Design a protein around this ligand. Structure first.
Ligand SMILES: [Ca+2]
Length: 279
């Protein structure tokens, strides 16, 4: 179904071309799947989440999202208006403080938490984790992301916003997870988007409207915004039975719009996330 006047990124992920504004998707909408948003938290009370979001873990004095970044990302995964998978269950894991910062040790603990926690949740169609965060290369951070993936979770991670090769960042550089670059509404690589061999896919990342704290909305940009498009897409596809956690990144690459993005450096995939939904 449509979304007439959907955010451009939603319309893009269900389209064979840029420049349209209706989002088309199977009504199953990720029902029975779960997506963990590992970030600054999620404002679960936001009407856009319809009771489908909840905080399950924090490493700080509160589970409240005092930043907005996590709420925005969660909105792109699964909010009613701004989300890819409009019926998924959203679980917030607050590894980032209200300034958007987090020690790698806390981020690692959060990933291992999700690998266990999914066994305490009802996700018959599958489990996804969205990591719109990163820093410099760390073998321990990469290994944590690898474990999470190995445990049966589709892990999607931001490539980073350095306009640089993502090989030097973590968890972006972990081969076994799905590393997500950002594009704009004109099918250009977003100017800040990292690139390189370690990228698996691109998603909408420039000027993305979604939920914000205080029951609000706003448009922001980043590989942080592209990542939840891919995470939501995975949840949606898993509900459809088209793929699994272990195979979703490959499946998304297999079925992506190919060769349509501009300013993709030689050696980086030219693949844009696409739901292949035929109304
Ligand atoms: Ca990767």
């Amino acid at each position: 179904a449509a979304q007439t006047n959907a955010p451009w990124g939603l319309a893009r992920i269900s389209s064979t071309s840029p420049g349209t504004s209706t989002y088309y998707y199977d009504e199953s909408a990720g029902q029975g799947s779960c997506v963990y948003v590992i970030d600054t938290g999620i404002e679960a009370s936001h009407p856009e989440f319809e009771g489908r979001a909840q905080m399950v873990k924090t490493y700080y004095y509160s589970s409240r999202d005092g930043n907005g970044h996590g709420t925005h990302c969660a909105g792109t995964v699964g909010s009613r208006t701004y989300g890819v998978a409009k019926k998924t269950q959203l679980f917030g894991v607050k590894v980032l403080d209200d300034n958007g910062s987090g020690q790698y040790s806390t981020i690692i603990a959060g990933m291992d938490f999700v690998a266990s926690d999914k066994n305490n949740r009802n996700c018959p169609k599958g489990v996804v984790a969205s990591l719109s965060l990163g820093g410099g290369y760390s073998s321990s951070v990469n290994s944590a992301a690898a474990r999470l993936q190995s445990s049966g979770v589709m892990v999607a991670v931001a490539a980073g916003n350095n306009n640089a090769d993502a090989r030097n960042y973590s968890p972006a550089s972990e081969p076994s997870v799905c590393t997500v670059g950002a594009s704009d509404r004109y099918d250009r690589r977003s100017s800040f988007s990292n690139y390189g061999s370690v990228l698996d896919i691109f998603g909408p990342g420039t000027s993305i409207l979604s939920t914000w704290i205080g029951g609000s909305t706003r448009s922001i940009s980043g590989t942080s915004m592209a990542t939840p498009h891919v995470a939501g897409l995975a949840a949606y596809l898993m509900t459809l039975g088209k793929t699994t956690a272990a195979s979703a990144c490959r499946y998304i690459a297999d079925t992506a719009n190919k060769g349509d993005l501009s300013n993709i450096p030689f050696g980086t995939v030219n693949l844009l996330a696409y739901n292949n939904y035929q109304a």
